[PDB]
Design a protein around this nucleic acid. Structure first.
Ligand SMILES: [Zn+2]
Length: 376
RNA sequence: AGCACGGCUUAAACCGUGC
């Protein structure tokens, strides 16, 4: 019933576990949100995604805009209906495509005009349009339109991009409030930029706080500066942001990264790793990452992870999946990904449990320990 | 093709190293 209602229920240091209440469902936090870029979480049926424990999936604007197209999905009944996921969905503004598809992109002030990475055509993605697109889709959590600042970057672009991104953060807000159908049902998040310079991360925070958002996300990180630098930034960045609103670290997601970011104060995560690595052949277990393609697993009858409760681990051997993935079989990508996502969820679960038991810091250290041991 | 590995923080059921 409530549009957006963040409510922290426990804390331990800069970390905290809570719940986000939206019209489409409840979101347990800290939470990990699987990435279903083009209206699908690679190799997984919506129900399976839910089966693993995800309360919310993330969809991308840039891609959806091009295919199957904003207006078309809308004409079909909204993304949710289109793909078969009735729980909340968070759509990215496409600010990531501005820095990864930068190749075929031309920046300005009105927005970012780029060429279809497959079609070749031309599209002008503006703060206005991005928010319109996200409205058409029917996304529950709308992300402002930003520009993920590449790394490394001189204090020049570091500020240009940032400042321009804020100007855009305002245009989004306005756009988001222009339609009451969207302002009454969805939520809006703002993205903090400024690379690794704090005096800049400060400005961005303030600019964002002035405008007013339902949730604040730290972006521009995990863009290749190593865990070290990132944590170093999160150390002063997350604190600049409004404490009574959720904090969302975009793109980050690697067991140890997530665990650390939580200690730093993050509430939400979204990342390609689990779903991409599944497809490729890498599985995430309590004993570190393992590449199921290795010769060793050829006759290994144990499951990907003996602690995992996932449906895969309850029924298939390493050797079976070894065989499949290695042979190009699709069932492999299905089992791998289902495992990895279920895993990230179980991880998010355990973190939450610990935070509301005041034993998270203990959890974290026990985690890295066994995680880096790799006695699997 | 294949074998032994490695990376991935959606232009990746993909790429890269060695034989
Ligand atoms: Zn599993």
């Amino acid at each position: 019933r409530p549009r957006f209602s963040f409510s922290i229920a426990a804390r331990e240091g800069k970390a905290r576990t809570g719940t986000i209440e939206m019209k489409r469902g409840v979101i347990r936090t800290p939470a990990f949100m699987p990435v279903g870029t083009a209206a699908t979480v690679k190799a997984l049926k919506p129900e399976t995604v839910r089966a693993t424990g995800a309360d919310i999936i993330l969809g991308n604007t840039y891609h959806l805009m091009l295919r199957p197209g904003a207006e078309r999905i809308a004409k079909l009944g909204g993304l949710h209906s289109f793909m078969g996921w009735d729980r909340p969905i968070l759509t990215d503004s496409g600010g990531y495509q501005v820095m990864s598809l930068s190749s075929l992109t031309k920046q300005s002030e009105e927005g970012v005009t780029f060429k279809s990475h497959l079609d070749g055509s031309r599209h002008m993605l503006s703060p206005e349009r991005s928010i319109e697109i996200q409205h058409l889709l029917g996304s529950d959590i709308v992300m402002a339109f930003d520009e993920c600042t590449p790394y490394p970057a001189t204090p020049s672009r570091a500020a240009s991009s940032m400042e321009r991104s804020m100007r855009w953060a305002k245009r989004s807000r306005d756009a988001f409030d222009s339609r009451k159908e969207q302002a009454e049902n969805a939520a809006l998040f703002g993205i903090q930029q400024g690379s690794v310079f704090e005096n800049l991360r400060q400005q961005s925070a303030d600019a964002l706080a002035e405008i007013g958002f339902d949730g604040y996300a730290v972006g521009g990180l995990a863009v290749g500066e190593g865990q070290d630098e990132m944590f170093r930034v999160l150390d002063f960045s997350v604190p600049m942001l409004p404490d009574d609103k959720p904090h969302y670290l975009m793109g980050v997601g690697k067991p140890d990264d997530i665990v650390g970011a939580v200690e730093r104060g993050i509430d939400m995560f979204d990342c390609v790793l689990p779903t991409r690595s599944g497809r490729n052949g890498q599985a995430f277990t309590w004993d570190g990452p393992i590449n199921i393609r290795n010769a060793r697993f050829s006759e290994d009858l144990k499951p990907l992870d003996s602690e995992c409760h996932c449906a895969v681990c309850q029924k298939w051997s390493r050797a079976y999946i070894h065989h499949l993935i290695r042979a190009g079989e699709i069932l492999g990508a299905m089992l791998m990904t289902e495992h990895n996502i279920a895993f990230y969820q179980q991880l998010m679960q355990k973190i939450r449990d610990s935070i509301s038991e005041g034993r998270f810091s203990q959890f974290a250290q026990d985690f890295r320990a066994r995680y880096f041991a790799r006695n699997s």
